[PDB]
Structures are given as structure tokens and as C-alpha cells.
Design an enzyme around this catalytic site. Sequence first.
Site, mmCIF file in Angstrom:
data_model
loop_
_atom_site.group_PDB
_atom_site.id
_atom_site.type_symbol
_atom_site.label_atom_id
_atom_site.label_comp_id
_atom_site.label_asym_id
_atom_site.label_seq_id
_atom_site.Cartn_x
_atom_site.Cartn_y
_atom_site.Cartn_z
ATOM 1 N N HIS A 5 38.793 36.340 37.916
ATOM 2 C CA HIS A 5 39.803 35.769 39.121
ATOM 3 C C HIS A 5 41.122 36.131 38.717
ATOM 4 O O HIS A 5 41.938 35.766 39.363
ATOM 5 C CB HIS A 5 39.685 34.273 39.444
ATOM 6 N N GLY A 31 47.786 28.513 33.729
ATOM 7 C CA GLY A 31 47.748 29.563 32.643
ATOM 8 C C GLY A 31 46.618 29.712 31.580
ATOM 9 O O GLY A 31 46.689 30.542 30.518
ATOM 10 N N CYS A 49 43.470 29.370 31.608
ATOM 11 C CA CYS A 49 42.041 30.151 32.048
ATOM 12 C C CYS A 49 42.027 31.221 31.202
ATOM 13 O O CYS A 49 42.935 31.790 30.815
ATOM 14 C CB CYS A 49 41.974 30.744 33.385
#
Lengths: 304, 304
Positions: free
Chosen positions: B41, B143, B145
Amino acid sequence: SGFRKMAFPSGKVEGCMVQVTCGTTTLNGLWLDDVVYCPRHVICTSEDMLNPNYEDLLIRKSNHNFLVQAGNVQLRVIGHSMQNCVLKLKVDTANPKTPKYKFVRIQPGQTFSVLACYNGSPSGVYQCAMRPNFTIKGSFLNGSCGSVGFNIDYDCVSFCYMHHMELPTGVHAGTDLEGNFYGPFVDRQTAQAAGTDTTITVNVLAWLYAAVINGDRWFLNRFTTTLNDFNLVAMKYNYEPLTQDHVDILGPLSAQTGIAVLDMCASLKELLQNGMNGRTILGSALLEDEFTPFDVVRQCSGVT
Amino acid sequence: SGFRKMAFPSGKVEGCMVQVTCGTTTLNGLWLDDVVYCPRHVICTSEDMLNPNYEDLLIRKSNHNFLVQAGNVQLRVIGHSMQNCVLKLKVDTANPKTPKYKFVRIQPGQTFSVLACYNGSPSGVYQCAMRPNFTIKGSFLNGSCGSVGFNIDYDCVSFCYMHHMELPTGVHAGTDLEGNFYGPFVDRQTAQAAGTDTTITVNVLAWLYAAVINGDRWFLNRFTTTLNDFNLVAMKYNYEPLTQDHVDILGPLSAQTGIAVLDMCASLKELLQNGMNGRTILGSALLEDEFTPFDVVRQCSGVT
Ligand SMILES: Nc1ccc(S(=O)(=O)Nc2ccccn2)cc1
Ligand SMILES: Nc1ccc(S(=O)(=O)Nc2ccccn2)cc1
């Protein structure tokens, strides 16, 4: 979202851990520049620990009696001195992994990370607080002495704790990196009882703010209080008295949430008087006091 | 003595963290050998996340659209591929700090350490468990991930988790390092509800053994039970059923303490039926289930 008991990343401190052996005693040392710091009781037999005269024991030791191993490489000891309750071993090689660092003496209620080590090898990292009675509640087995506590500000490690002792009650005592014990404790195997382990009120309030930010809100009530009224309740429940300095420190969390500090005090007062009634806050069934206001801001803002 | 929620030392993983940017999305990547692993993603706008077609989005991306920064140095991307829900970015430089490592897919109830990171920079380390509903209860802000979960066996890092999502209920979902989600979750911003968060029975029993080893013994009672009788109680309280495999795994802790596993089950049964009555075990007012039997042995034996 979510809120966890979080330690500092440990890599910068892992790079500093060594093994120190004197005769048959092995423990951990901290290698910064060309100095290795370790507990002075490295020079004691278990028999010596009952009643040690450290100056007299140290006279029988030479540089070559201190074996310092960094991974599987031996460091050459070129000097030794005792400062309070720590030995400083001067080695001929500066630690190439020495981070930016300071030595700080923390106040009760301040939190720090511990890197638990055995034979100079890191085993685990966890978060501690200096208790109001100057003990810490750690996880330390035989061989863990010389493991250190620290905080990190960006790239600078502030070392605040070195592990020395377990009291007969199974709580822990140690020194700053100048070798001065926190509290009244001594490096002798004798009766040393701890004072009241009071709850760190300003840290509980910080954690209740963390709870609100993360959506745990059931304990917010319709009341307020005053510092004096709150403090009568704190005294009854063995909580530290709350000062205007603590109210000032909680200002940013008050501003973020829109809950006045004295309103959160009134929520805490009701929790003390009524209990949790089988409910939880941030997955805890008791009021957590090992997060500082700075910890809550840091974790809630994602500081690296 | 003492028993703490303990994470693995994080240095070996700190050495692997990088920043990945695609267009206006920045998150974390894991650099092992000449491959950087990150959530797919990274290629999505917040608009894209509502209903992404990842193969179609990826066709619009070239190697030069993936900006990989390791500290303040840029890495050259020479290939990219999607494996399940992770991107693998091939770089022209092997990570010099690559530790010995494996990729493992863990079972529910297994614990691991998380190194929470922002912009490729470590902020903190904490201990997690894979919940029985295949969520984790982490601490992750925007932030975070691509932050990873891991276990360490001496010098070998077993990577088991990469962070991808926060569910609307504020619990967390992610993948193994092959990019397969734990549980039924998907990398789309849509309604995804979690199943029952049952208590990990074998881990509670492990922690009660840890409590006895560390001198917390008040909950030991005069009773025993059977697996079937215990399991009727577990079912009532949303505890995982206990199997003979779990009894076998608790064998070393049974042997150390001299408390038969079914006797400790009978102590746990009474705690479930009676509650804690305002008492604590290892500083907890609830029954802790994020220590495995292996965790308890490791911490109680001082493995490095
Ligand atoms: N709790 C405590 C504090 C200090 C000491 S001592 O090792 O300094 N030895 C002393 C101190 C006073 C009287 C006799 N020996 C021992 C126990
Ligand atoms: N909870 C959940 C699981 C999968 C999906 S989907 O993105 O695969 N899209 C789908 C799946 C089924 C029907 C329509 N879209 C969306 C939500």
C-alpha cells in the site's frame, strides 16, 4: 492508536556491553571511549559481600586481574580507579561503537529503559521507573549486575542507572554512572529494607490522558477538585503529593485533550475511592504509574 | 528475581530499517541482503486505499518511483515485484548490517517484539502476542506501516510480522514477510470487524508458574482438575481450550516448581470463578496472557 509500555531501541547500548571478570566473579561492564564502567563488587567473593572493605580488597588487585572481553576479543586494561561504588577500567582501545552520551542522575518517578545482560551479552529490554523509595522493580538474575538503564534524546544516550543489588524483598538497587547509589542502599549483603512504595501521581495522570487520546474514556466524570483536596485523597492512598510543577508539566496533555488537569485529578480521585469495578484502562486493571508526561507525549506523537 | 514484559534487544533489526517513499506516501522498509520489503500500500493515495486494484496501480510505477533511504544515503532500486501484500524492492547494495535471519509465520498465542519506526527511524520496542482472532494490540501511528515483529534465537532474527493496518476498533493487522495477512484481514480501508479476543490459556498458566518462581504464591489452592473440567470453565470465560500439547509444553515449568499442570489449572479455575479480590500477581490486577512458556523459561534462566 494503541499505547504500549515501550522501551528505547537498545542498539546504541548493545554496542557498549562487555564482560568483566575479576578472579571468579563475572558481571557486565559499559565500554564508552577508552573506559569500562562496572560495579566495584566485581572484586568480591560471595563471602566478601557480607562485610566488604572495598579499599582494602582493591589493594590486592592489579590491572591484569581485570579480564575485559568485548564479544570474543580481549581488551587490554592499562589503569583502574574506584569512584564511589563503580570501578573505571581504562583500556588501550576506544570503543568504536561509542554513541553520543551523557551521565545523568534521575529523580524518583522518572522512567528509563534497562538492557538486561549476562556475560556481556544482551538478553532483553524493558521499561522501569525510579520508585519514590529509590528502588526499581526489574528483572535481574545472578550475572546481571552492571546492566544499565538509559534514555535516548535523538542520537544521545543518557545513562542513568547501573544494576548492583537485589534486596531481600526481591526489588532492585543501583547507582548512577558516577557510582552513587539511588536512595540509602549500600553494596553489602546485609538487611536493607525499602520505605513506602508510593504511587507516582503525575505519571498516573499522564497515563489517564494517554487513555483518553486512545479512546478509553469511561472513567471521565462530572467533577473537579483542587490540589489541596486531591492531596488529602493522595495521602490516604499512598500517592505522591501533586505540586503546581506537576500541573505545569501536564499542560500539553491538558491542551491536546481539552481536559483541565484538576478535572482529571477529580476522575483519579473517584477511581481511588470507587475502584475499577472490574473494568480496564489501556488493558490494565490497576492505575499505571510508569509512564511520564514526556513518555505519553513522545509515544502519542511518534518521536524517533 | 522479578519478572518484566521484556522485548528482544532491537539492535540487529535497527540495522535493517529504511524509509520507502512512493509519490507522496512514506513508510518503513526492511533491508535484508539486496532486497527491501515493505507494505504494497506504499503505492496507494488515501483515496486509493478505499478500493485499491494493486496490480493496476503497480503498472504505473517504475523502479525510479520507489525512493529508498538508509540513514541519509539513497539506495538504487534495480527491480520491484509484488508477493501477496508486500513489495520486494531489489537494490544494488547488500545491507552490510544484514543479520542471520529467517522468515517464520507464527501461530496465534505466540509472542514477538515490535520495533516501531517512523521515516525508517526506530522510536521504540515492545512485546506483542498474535491474538487468537489474528489481530495484535500494538502502538502504531500514521507512518509506522512496515515496522516489523521478530524473535531472536542467539544470533538469528526470525521475522514474523510486518505492520499494515489499523482496524476501525483501533487494533492492528499485518502480514508475515511473505506478505500473507494473519487472519482474514485485507489491505483495504473498509469495514473489517475482529472475532472474539479469547485469552491465551497456556500463556496465563506459564505466567502463573513465573509468579510462583518469583514468590507470588497467594493464588495456589488445595484443588486439582481435569482437562475436560477445566475446559468447561475456559469456554465460559472466553479462554482458549487447553490441549495435551499445551500440558506437554508446560512440563519444564511443572518440573521446576513441583506444581502439576492440572493443579495450576485448578488455581486458574478458582481465579476465573472468584476474581483477584483486589490482589495482584507480578504487579498485575488481571491474568496476563502475553508470555509464552518459552518466554517464561528464557527470562527465568537468563538466555542471551
Ligand atoms: N542498611 C545499611 C546501610 C549501611 C551499612 S554499612 O555497610 O555502611 N555498615 C554499617 C553501617 C552502620 C553501622 C554498622 N555498619 C549497613 C546496612
Ligand atoms: N472484510 C473484507 C474482506 C475483503 C474485502 S475485499 O477488498 O476483498 N473486497 C470485496 C470482498 C467481497 C465482496 C466485495 N468486495 C473487503 C472487506
